[model samples]
Target: GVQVETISPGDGRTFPKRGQTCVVHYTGMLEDGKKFDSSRDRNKPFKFMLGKQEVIRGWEEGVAQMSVGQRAKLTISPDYAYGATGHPGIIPPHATLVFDVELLKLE
Candidate 1:
């Protein structure tokens, strides 16, 4: 059974600062611990910058709290994850998400 843990503090300390581009390795799963997506399989990490709005609310918020090489687990509610407009074959509407992320860096 997989577990989720927010290692870093969420008091606005671990969140990515504005303009910080992070290269993070992640594995997303469901509450049942079923894996959905993983960068490890591709042997590549995903990249995104802070305040870019390029990701879900939970992801954007989670990345902000990490530094280069830090790892954490994020639990996201449906509203902050996929919402009602779900991504077919990828995510369902009102679905919760779990991501184990490794913060790479700011840009």
Candidate 2:
């Protein structure tokens, strides 16, 4: 896998180790910069496992580059973003993704 790093600190969380879980707050967007998902809208955070095939590969990889109190804009390729089986409603199949993530906590 091609490694990438975020300059924004992944929206305020620490880089997660394998098998670690994180309670994160985030927003997702497409390459056109249209927002698709947001924790801010729901007024809640999202939790997922790191390096555990929890979400998409992009997020798993992108979040690993962050530190606590970091905000990041992760530009993920379609291959690692969503692939062919894309999420319904927001993500199109084979679509690239951009995530504005806030790292809340690692658990």
Candidate 3:
């Protein structure tokens, strides 16, 4: 499960569909506020193809609701994030994750 709050709604009417490429800025963290990853820190927005299992379940589900230019905060349960195994080092087992995401473009 996940909760999403729109920080800044995008003006674009169309949202990305399956197979569409999306460019976004995002910061990922643990529930305890431990930082894990961020596109901003990389000095470039992350890019992924929608509905492709290229990211986590929460990201796929939550980002689908966004439009280009939209910014949102997502609180994702462990079940929807890295799950029981989680990502080693960065995310602990069964860890909840938070993400601040901005949709920049869709193609």
Q: Which candidate is the best by TM-score?
A: 3
Worst 10 residues of 3 by lDDT: 37-46
Q: Give the TM-score of candidate 2.
A: 0.77
Please, what is the whole-model Cα lDDT of each candidate in the order they appear? Answer: 0.72, 0.70, 0.83
lDDT, candidate 3, 1-107, per-residue tens: 87888899898597788889888888887777687867865565888887687888788887887888899998888888888887678887888888888988886
- lDDT winner, 1 or 2: 1
The worst-scoring run of ten residues by lDDT in candidate 2 lies at 1-10
Off by over 4 Å in 1: 1-4, 7-15, 41-43
The best candidate by lDDT is 3
Clashing pairs in 2: 9-70, 11-70, 11-71, 11-72, 11-102, 11-103, 12-69, 12-70, 12-103, 13-67
Clashing residue pairs, candidate 3?
none
Please report, as a residue range, the 10-residue window in candidate 1 with the lowest summed lDDT: 1-10
Model 1 error, position 101 (Å): 0.7
